[PDB]
Design a protein around this ligand. Structure first.
Ligand SMILES: CCN(CC)c1nc2c(C(=O)O)c(O)c(I)c(-n3cccc3)c2s1
Ligand SMILES: [Zn+2]
Length: 196
């Protein structure tokens, strides 16, 4: 079993957005449109914007889940490595095995799927504040892409789904993620590799 990664705007015109953070050595999170890939440091804030063309119903939620990008690994659950799942860095809500956390939202819920064993984190879909045109969720990634016994250098995607109150699909978007010590340098390197 493998979750779908097909982009689907749905009835509400759902899609993600990312800030323009640049590639300076000091950057902690930076998004490459050319690669559709987020580069971020371990456990640092990753702002992900949610955009819609029309307001979804009360009770709509937004779920995040990681899968391996390579087909030969897609059936393996993405989880924290044997070190990080034991490192006592709980925020009081996220299970220590979960790679993806939501920062600063007490209504976040963490799911261990009873059938697929996959992890996800889901929040209620809140309207933009007055003066804003979108809503932002702040994610944290709690292992490096290189962590041995976990991701082990394998690339991952994050799939963001807009869901109704029953969990039915309303919209879907996705992006690759690399969790690394120097996201600005790695984004520059990979964009150069793509250009060459
Ligand atoms: C169901 C609650 N609700 C009505 C009050 C919402 N309205 C919006 C609006 C809007 O009315 O403009 C929006 O632009 C975005 I982006 C939203 N959002 C939040 C996470 C995903 C989408 C929500 S949630
Ligand atoms: Zn780790």
């Amino acid at each position: 079993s493998v979750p779908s990664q097909k982009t689907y705007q749905g009835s509400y015109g759902f899609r993600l957005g990312f800030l323009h953070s640049g590639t300076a050595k000091s950057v902690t999170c930076t998004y490459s449109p050319a690669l559709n890939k987020l580069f971020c440091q371990l456990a640092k804030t990753c702002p992900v914007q949610l955009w819609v063309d029309s307001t979804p119903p009360p009770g709509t939620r937004v779920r995040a889940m990681a899968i391996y990008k390579q087909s030969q690994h897609m059936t393996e659950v993405v989880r924290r490595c044997p070190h990080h799942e034991r490192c006592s860095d709980s925020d009081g809500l996220a299970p220590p095995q979960h790679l993806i956390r939501v920062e600063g939202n007490l209504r976040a819920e963490y799911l261990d799927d009873r059938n697929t064993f996959r992890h996800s984190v889901v929040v209620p879909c809140e309207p933009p504040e007055v003066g804003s045109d979108c809503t932002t969720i702040h994610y944290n990634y709690m292992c490096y892409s290189s962590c041995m016994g976990g991701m082990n250098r394998r690339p991952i995607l994050t799939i963001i789904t807009l869901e109704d109150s029953s969990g039915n699909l309303l919209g879907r978007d996705s992006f690759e993620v690399r969790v690394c010590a120097c996201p600005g340098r790695d984004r520059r390197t990979e964009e150069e590799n793509l250009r060459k």
